Design a protein around this ligand. Sequence first.
Ligand code: ICS
Ligand code: ICS
Ligand code: CLF
Ligand code: CLF
Ligand SMILES: [Fe+3]
Ligand SMILES: [Fe+3]
Lengths: 453, 477, 522, 522
Amino acid sequence: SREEVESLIYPEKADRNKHLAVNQSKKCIISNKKSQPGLMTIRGCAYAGSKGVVWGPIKDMIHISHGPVGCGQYSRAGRRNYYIGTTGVNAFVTMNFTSDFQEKDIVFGGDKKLAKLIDEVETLFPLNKGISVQSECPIGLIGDDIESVSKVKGAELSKTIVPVRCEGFRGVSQSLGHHIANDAVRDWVLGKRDEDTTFASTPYDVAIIGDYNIGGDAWSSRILLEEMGLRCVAQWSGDGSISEIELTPKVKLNLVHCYRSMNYISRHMEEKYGIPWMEYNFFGPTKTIESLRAIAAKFDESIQKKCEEVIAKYKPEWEAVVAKYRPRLEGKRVMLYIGGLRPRHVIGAYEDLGMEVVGTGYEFAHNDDYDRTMKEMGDSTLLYDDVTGYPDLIGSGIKEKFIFQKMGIPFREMHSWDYSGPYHGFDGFAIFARDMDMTLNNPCWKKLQAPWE
Amino acid sequence: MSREEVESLIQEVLEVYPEKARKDRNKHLAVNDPAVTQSKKCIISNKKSQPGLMTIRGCAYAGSKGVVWGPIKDMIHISHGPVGCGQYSRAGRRNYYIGTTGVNAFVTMNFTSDFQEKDIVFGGDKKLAKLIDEVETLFPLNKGISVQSECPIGLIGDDIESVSKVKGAELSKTIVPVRCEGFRGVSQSLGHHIANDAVRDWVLGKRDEDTTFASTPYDVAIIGDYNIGGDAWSSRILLEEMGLRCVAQWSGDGSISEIELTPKVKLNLVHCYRSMNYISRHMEEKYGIPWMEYNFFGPTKTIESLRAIAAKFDESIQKKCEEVIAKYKPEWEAVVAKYRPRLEGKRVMLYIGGLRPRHVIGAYEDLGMEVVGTGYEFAHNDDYDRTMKEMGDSTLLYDDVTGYEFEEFVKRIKPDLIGSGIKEKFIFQKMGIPFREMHSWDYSGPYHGFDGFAIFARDMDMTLNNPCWKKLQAPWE
Amino acid sequence: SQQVDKIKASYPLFLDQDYKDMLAKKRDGFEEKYPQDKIDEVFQWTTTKEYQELNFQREALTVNPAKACQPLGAVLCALGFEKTMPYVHGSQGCVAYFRSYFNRHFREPVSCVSDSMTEDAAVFGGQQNMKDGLQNCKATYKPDMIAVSTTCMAEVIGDDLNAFINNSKKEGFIPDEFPVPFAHTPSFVGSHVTGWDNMFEGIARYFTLKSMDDKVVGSNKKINIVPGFETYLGNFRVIKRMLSEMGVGYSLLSDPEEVLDTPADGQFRMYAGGTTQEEMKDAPNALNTVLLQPWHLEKTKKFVEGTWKHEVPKLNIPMGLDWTDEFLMKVSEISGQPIPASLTKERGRLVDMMTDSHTWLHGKRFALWGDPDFVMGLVKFLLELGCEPVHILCHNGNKRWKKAVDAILAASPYGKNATVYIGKDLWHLRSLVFTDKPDFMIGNSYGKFIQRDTLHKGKEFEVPLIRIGFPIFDRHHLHRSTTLGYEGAMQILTTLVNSILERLDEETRGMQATDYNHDLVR
Amino acid sequence: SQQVDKIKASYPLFLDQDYKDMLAKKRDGFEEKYPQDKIDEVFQWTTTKEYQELNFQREALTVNPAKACQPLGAVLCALGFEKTMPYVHGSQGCVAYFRSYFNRHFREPVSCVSDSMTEDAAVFGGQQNMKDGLQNCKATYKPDMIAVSTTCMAEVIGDDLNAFINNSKKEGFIPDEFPVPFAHTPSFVGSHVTGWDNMFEGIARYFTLKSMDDKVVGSNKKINIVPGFETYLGNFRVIKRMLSEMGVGYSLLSDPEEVLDTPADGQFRMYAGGTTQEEMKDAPNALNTVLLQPWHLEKTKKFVEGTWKHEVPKLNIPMGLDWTDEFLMKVSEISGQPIPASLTKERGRLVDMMTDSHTWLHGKRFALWGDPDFVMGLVKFLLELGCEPVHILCHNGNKRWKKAVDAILAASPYGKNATVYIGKDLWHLRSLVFTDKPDFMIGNSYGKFIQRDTLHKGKEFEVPLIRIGFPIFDRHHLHRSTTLGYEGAMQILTTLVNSILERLDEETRGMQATDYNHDLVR
Ligand code: ICS
Ligand code: ICS
Ligand code: CLF
Ligand code: CLF
Ligand SMILES: [Fe+3]
Ligand SMILES: [Fe+3]
């Protein structure tokens, strides 16, 4: 009950009470504030939100982790943003380009080192279609000016070089990294084809924004969208190229998957180019059908007819998936804790498998995300914002994965899909239901107690 | 070691045997004399093994199924009897072949009747007939069946010749009954003889009245090369480079049609005299085909054998032989230049089955290594007649050496390298002496011919000069 | 031709153009080979369900068996006793094959002698062979005990081992007090595990049958452990380590781990360790006897319950979590020693490993073969992991064992598509993996050939092999592994999950084709 | 489309014809991709020696490094003490990355906290951050000790750890008696092993610098063992086992094996085991201190020699036969305990395995990388096996270490074709393995990408990766392995020989093409 959860909800300062609530979110929960020091939080940094999330999945561009070696090393290939390309030749997603700052670079700056690095990148990787420079913590503290270096080298090499001031100490979490990376996209990449009219546009031109192709989720969404008669001109960042970002201002509709990480750019495109945008949810058959119908409602009747055809075609497959896996998953309760979008976007498929969601929370989401989350959750459920480490299933990240695993609760990685996926679309729903069954009903959870104890 | 020291060592080793065992074993140990041409005056061979003395010899089944018949690839060989004999011999010999295993080649598979108690009590002739029917059903591309008898077959009175005759007449298929029961004889030599008799009686004369084969003056067959690691291939490439046409290969990578075509060749080149002299003499007395022993171990023996073979043909073959020798001279000279300084002066003790204890001596001498002890498991006295002139003076000769005997000989002689089988390899690796498997080529090879000499030299250097042999004693002892 | 700077062995020397040309000339001129289209047709036929129906109708033909003969197991049992020489009455070729087999599996010297019975002994028996062989063996190799088994030749002619040995002692060939236990091990009955059982029962009967008057059950406060046919040294080591952890006094009967793992220190040790004759004589005084592999120790169980009066517990092989737990609890109940905290922590660590790798292991399909106890323990562990043991083959299995394994499979949701085959060989399993393809095979080195066959049908049809069992010839030092206990379960789990991961990496290594799933983190 | 009876994950779901067509449409319509012929040409160019010459002229650009930053090693050192919380003064994203890295490698919970320094700390410093963080950490997680390292931001802005912690104690945020050792870990200096060295030296100086007046060397008859940056739990276990077998009293300083191997029994233990504060306080009373990894324990060595007055032996990492022998002999000399017969038998068994596998191991060419001590121990062992370590890369090595490795290589005839590189990354190694192809690679999971690249050039140019080192992400439970001592040498030798044999089996699996060498017995 609500009373029980309130009773369930540290020195005097440890704020934490405002970030915990029982399901205008601002009057109920307080979000996007500083983490309490020394409390083992899950939050990343602005560099992770910019390099690791927004810019890193862009395959034909080379992203330089400007600064010491650690930040680039720990984020190398850790995110499963899938792509197609020849790595090291025309795609560089899983590679780690770093300036590897030393003591002399801290003392005297690394602007000359950055220029030399850009020259060497051009020499050794000629097929790169652009360079981004993701700043790490020392860059903004030693007075380095990467904007001037980027301008000079871009003019000299006729290359698009995007300086991103994504120093980790900026902001409270990866959300400011998302904002900074979106601003960099707007300032350096988005408006490159403003005077270019050589692109042949169609009335059914859509772009996919904020889908990072985790396990191929964006591909599973795109196949449904194109089966519907639409043309996905742009799809970034997941399996995204720089040309797609440049061609995004030419589409007729923007489909934003992660509102948290791309609302800035969606709003900017709406003000500037007049492109309407809306959110879509392809998680679970019910949300997928609802989103497909809503998308088709923005076009002529032929798109709606093709949408009905697609829904009818895919109905038997997800119906068979439900018939197979729902009996093994009825009456199971789920609690979640993911970064900024998934904590409310995953409820649909859990309900489509007969599961009850009793808990969710966000690492870094803002109060608008909690506004959206309130209706998606039932009452008397605990909501937590930036909850510290201190049900039948818990869906969260890798760092809490092993804590909850050793506490005995079956756990699912809701960041990387536990190295599985995709989870979006109908094929994603099939994979997701199979993974839910394999994790929840595994015998390994029945053997935690020794028979002699 | 001088002659008297070797005789004294033989006496000390024999001292621990019982009276009968010591008297029997004194006839199988000798000090070599290269001037002696009659080996029965110094050594006695091809005798019964002393019971309970850990001999290395196999059985007649091993000499027949594992040696002569098994390498035939398009034939299916049934280990008739219990499961063990066929199981332990499955793919244990590296007689290389080309073919699709289970479709048209069956060398590495184990076909057995898997005798049970009822088969022992009531016989296995009906089981053999039904097995032949099932083989024909499930392996239609087999070009013949052989039935290798294990020990119980000859003790329960099973008539496999009659079954083979009836089923061969019914299926128009060549079914060869081989009476290679393990208790027969004293070693694998009787197995070789029985398998050769079976080839003569069931396979060799199938095309006696056939004349459709187009014969050339340069027609040769390779008899007794079982392609251990591709040895027969490395010999055959050299033979074909001299302008000769190798028609048959016995039996490594050998087909039944090559055996049937062998009586059409102009020369028989016998590598293993021990296992194929019977069939070579039969072919001489029946088809008038001369046979000669060759040696392709090391460059000097390969060159001598090539010239001797070319001397049996016209002058064009001799010109081609000289061209081949000239072509391969720089390569083996480079091998010698690289590896002889690493191997010169080292001493080798050998103990192999019936041909290699004397055939590989030239290869060792080509690298500067001297053989101080050698012996056989199952050789006859003609093999020792050929062996004494090859061995040096005052060296050791052992026939059917026992584990204790050969261990003591190694302990007193202290060689740098030992070449023997798998049942002594780890004994001598633990004793600290570098060991090279001279049966399977230590899963390396080939060793025949010029291409094999490079591998042989590299393997000898790798084993003999490995750092591990310098690390057996703990530094705190 | 060879380059002295880069010397090629057979592979890839024979892939050269001249060697390929020579082989093609040979094949086209004299081999009378079937056309390649016919060979491909027959192979595709062998991969079908019709061929499977024809294959499973076999009654007289056995192709690629998965078992050996009894005297091999008898030799393995005899090697586990202190300064004991295995002596196989019969033909010497059998002993040569036994020694070669064990040398290839263990890469260690294997001591075994024969009396070399020949054609003459086939008429008047091997009495003289036995007398001379016993005298020669004792004089030459100086063993504390000679353990005598038989080959098929000695069994068929009906040689009386007891009478022969008694006569040998009567004429003075060997001392009357010298221990010469014997066992009849007919190769046409059972398999190598049956021979191990027969040899152990013979040794136990020789040392304990006539001296049961002064024996009191439980008077030495120890538990007898009979391991059976075991070719993993880690299994002996883990059983001894776990029994020492619990504080339990134990007597491992037939312990060959020392003689099969001798050091290379410049000297050769014919004997090392082993069960002592004092332990065998004192065995009836133990609290109880535990048979680690009960499904091939039936004769041993009959003797131990009938003569030693030991209430042998009904225990499965300590393979996997649940059966290791039951073995530990039974040992705790017999000895009275509580299970210590270290074993509980080891169990928890195994469960942690199970939980870490359950995503990759769940639902994976396995064909598997081996000996009855090993196969059933592996099936039990696979069911504990969420895997599907589709094809369960045991050539030396019987109907009762198949019924027990079916009862195990029926108690798990993951045994639905599982079928148990007994009396079937590896050609049957080849047909099974062609018609009902599993994800992996688990078995000895012979299964490698099956993998080759599957790869001939296509890369998508290839069934990779996981080498667990006996014998493993194509890999080194795998005989040092462990399959029993929590340590063995962890080793097996690591092997399985990492084999899955290597297969996934190989299938996703194609650049710009499948490398989108070539994940750094798995 | 998905079949409910056979559900495909991303592989091979995206190989379906509809997915393939959609991806082709994407690429042809909107990606503006370079033509496949240009991509192939550029890849072939990257595989050449001209590209390698350009690559090795790199001055400012680092591609695919083989090292991490200092606070990671500091966290790993702090995790090795009893109920100790790693506390990284600086930004929280660093701690998130550290925990994710160690979680992926060990598949265990990793405890670490940050004071979450932000732009406000960029101007005034993180003094308030330190006070609040220490207070909250002590109140929430109740540790016995908080070990403080720094991120690059705190080092750049110049935060005084000593003054900050002293002020925190003076203002009552933490008790004056609560242990808060600290270390400055500038991520732009050295690598993670440097961070481990700095953290250990800071903890030792905290616990021993002010209380040296009552310390007598050898008064507790113990030897201090400092393992350094170690990511194999088997290494800690093998060192403790070897010292216990010798009967040697020891104190393993910074022992994290217990907290990185917590059992899954239904409760979460944030702390488990570790070096106690009493052990660290009594450390100056030991007979001597032995550094397992001397090449990244320089600062620790200066502190132990200059303050504890310990004559630290000049010992290499106990990796392989010779160096394990010298380590055991030095320990025997220091403690006066003779080397027992069990260790001698273990050494003999390792030598026996070496003799068994030398034919397959001899002459094999290797590219290897990792930390300095690990790399040099691997090179020494490979030379002991008759292998050829052609490429020896160490991104965090120095000139003195390179000189030592060159001296090691010069002493062996197998190190003639060996080159040592320092300051080079995995792109340099990719160029090296393309232009001078080795047989195998030894390194962490990152080398897998190099393998993929080699497979792109051809199957005859593919360099397989043998996964030994840190971090290993794509395989499960390999962190449980051992690399030190005779046991670690046996594990490494088995891995190497079996990788060689698996590669040979894969190369010879082609039916009627290369399966003449598909030997059952190897
Ligand atoms: S971008 Fe964000 S933490 Fe919106 S930083 Fe994070 S691939 Fe999460 S809840 Mo990892 S705001 Fe994406 C996210 Fe959500 S990396 Fe992925 S799963 S939908
Ligand atoms: S056949 Fe004989 S034991 Fe002549 S049974 Fe044996 S493949 Fe030996 S010395 Mo193994 S008479 Fe051949 C032989 Fe020599 S199996 Fe090979 S190596 S040249
Ligand atoms: S000497 Fe030779 S190998 Fe020996 S049996 Fe006889 S033919 Fe055969 Fe066979 S099944 Fe086992 S291994 Fe024997 S005891 Fe019988
Ligand atoms: S919050 Fe973010 S990840 Fe942290 S440093 Fe800052 S940009 Fe980077 Fe980098 S090298 Fe190591 S991991 Fe840091 S201490 Fe510096
Ligand atoms: Fe060995
Ligand atoms: Fe774990």
